[PDB]
Paper text:
The 4-methoxyphenyl and indole ring systems of Fragments 23 and 24 overlap perfectly, while the 6-boronic acid group of fragment 24 partially extends into the SAM adenine pocket and makes hydrogen bonds with the backbone amides of residues Tyr136 and Leu138 and further water-mediated hydrogen bond contacts to the backbone amides of Val131, Ile133, Gly134 and the side chain hydroxyl group of Ser132. While the observed fragment hits and the corresponding merged compound AW1 satisfy many of the predicted protein-hotspot interactions, the map also suggested further potential interactions that could stabilise elaborated fragments. AW1 occupies Hotspot 1 at the base of the TrmD active site, where it satisfies the hydrogen-bond donor requirements by interacting with the backbone amide oxygen atoms of Gly134 and Tyr136. The merged compound AW1 also orients its pyrazole nitrogen atom in the acceptor map in this region where it forms a hydrogen bond with the backbone NH of Leu138. The compound could be elaborated further towards the methionine end of the active site and by further extension to the second hotspot region at the top of the active site. Structure-guided elaboration of the merged compound AW1 (Kd 0.11 mM, LE 0.36, IC50 0.23 mM) was performed, initially utilizing the indole nitrogen as a vector for growth.
TrmD (tRNA-(N(1)G37) methyltransferase) is an essential tRNA modification enzyme in bacteria that prevents +1 errors in the reading frame during protein translation and represents an attractive potential target for the development of new antibiotics. TrmD belongs to a distinct class of S-adenosyl-l-methionine (SAM)-dependent methyltransferases known as the SpoU-TrmD (SPOUT) RNA methyltransferase superfamily or Class IV methyltransferases. Each non-crystallographic 2-fold symmetry-related protomer of TrmD interacts in an antiparallel manner and consists of two domains: a larger N-terminal domain spanning residues 1–161 and a smaller C-terminal helical domain (177–242) connected by a flexible inter-domain linker. The SAM binding region of TrmD is located at the base of the N-terminal domain and consists of a deep trefoil knot architecture, made of three distinct untwisted loop regions.
Numbering used by the authors:
A (entry chain A): 0 to 159, 178 to 227
B (entry chain B): 0 to 17, 28 to 44, 47 to 159, 177 to 232
Write the structure that this text describes.
């Protein structure tokens, strides 16, 4: 039973993932993903969501008054507020598992040079707030990160070393045969072979994990 | 000038991409023949594996020897900002999006005999397929295309006082040197707290 609210100035970005949800989970009321246009909470006829940064610098900062009103309406005491940012704590599988048991996630998607820091700081005085990064690269905004987090979390909600290579038919293709051990019927040996493949791949690609 | 082709069994998922660059999305099922792209794994295991035959045909049509073939996978080399800068100079990226339990390894191995191949992970979490990773890679790369360390500290804008929370006074002081020093300090503090690995310290 999880509800996810996403707030963004580009609601159309999230539309595919909304549609991608299985009806059986939606009908069972096990999951609901709602997307909100941040501009619903703007104060002015120009629907302004950003303003110049204090202390100077490039780009713009999203307005605290707008975000404050949005979160006031959408969040409750039980909300886990997720704020994607390149400066965040790392979002990992452990994080995804933890958040998969939450009743209400709100994902605040920033743009430009991010959201006025007081928004998160204020919210943290009455709900749990998690500023997170999905990887060491910079995006244009939080929307792609939201898609990633939603996918990684929801697939752990029941109802909705590195892995080595996998193979399927045909046994020979473009001069390459499936490793004979996999067709050996020696399942103890197959397990040992897969372990070694995983070890070698981890050494080559992710020595940090060792 | 960059071309990006994405191959997927779920082309509709890639609508979120909304003259220096063209992005094209191809339905993998276009290269099937009889009225299945997946089969059970050799050696056992849960789930299904995408057959190499259909992928080979698709990539034969879409790739050239100059192509950088990108294959999202949880077991990939890390995709980082450095990678994004590197790929931002490429003429042609092809992103092969897996589903099920992944793609038969021979697809990448075969392709690597004709072109450069990069199996990459966008982070240490598991997705349902390569499509979300493709969106992340495309965004991170295209923003670096010509014509298109430490953690950043907090940013602020008007009003200077909000809900009884004040913008740090130094930011209103107009003293460029003091502001630079404060921002550097905030960045160091944030990096130590959130990403100590970036400064060569142990992770929590
Ligand atoms: N891991 C990661 C997060 C982001 C991100 C998140 C929000 C915003 C808002 C403006 N730029 C942003 C970038 N980039 N990379
Ligand atoms: N970094 C990361 C990549 C993926 C990914 C990529 C392709 C497939 C195909 C089936 N599941 C997949 C997962 N998850 N997390």
């Amino acid at each position: 039973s999880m509800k996810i609210d996403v707030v963004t100035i580009f609601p159309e970005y999230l539309q595919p993932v909304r549609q991608s949800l299985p009806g059986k989970a939606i009908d069972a009321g096990l999951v609901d993903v709602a997307v909100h246009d941040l501009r619903r909470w703007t104060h002015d006829v120009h629907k302004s969501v950003d303003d110049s940064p204090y202390g100077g610098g490039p780009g713009m900062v999203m307005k605290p008054t707008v975000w404050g009103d949005a979160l006031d309406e959408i969040c409750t005491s039980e909300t886990l507020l997720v704020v994607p940012t390149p400066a965040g704590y790392p979002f990992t599988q452990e994080t995804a598992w933890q958040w998969s048991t939450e009743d209400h996630l709100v994902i605040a998607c920033g743009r430009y040079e991010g959201i006025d820091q007081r928004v998160a700081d204020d919210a943290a005085t009455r709900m749990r707030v998690r500023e997170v990064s999905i990887g060491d690269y910079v995006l244009n905004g939080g929307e792609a990160a939201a898609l990633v987090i939603i996918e990684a979390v929801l697939r752990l909600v029941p109802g909705v070393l590195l892995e080595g290579p996998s193979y399927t038919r045909p046994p020979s293709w473009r001069g390459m045969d499936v490793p004979p051990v996999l067709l050996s019927g020696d399942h103890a040996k197959i397990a040992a072979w897969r372990a070694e493949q995983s070890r070698q791949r981890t050494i080559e690609r992710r020595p940090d994990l060792l």
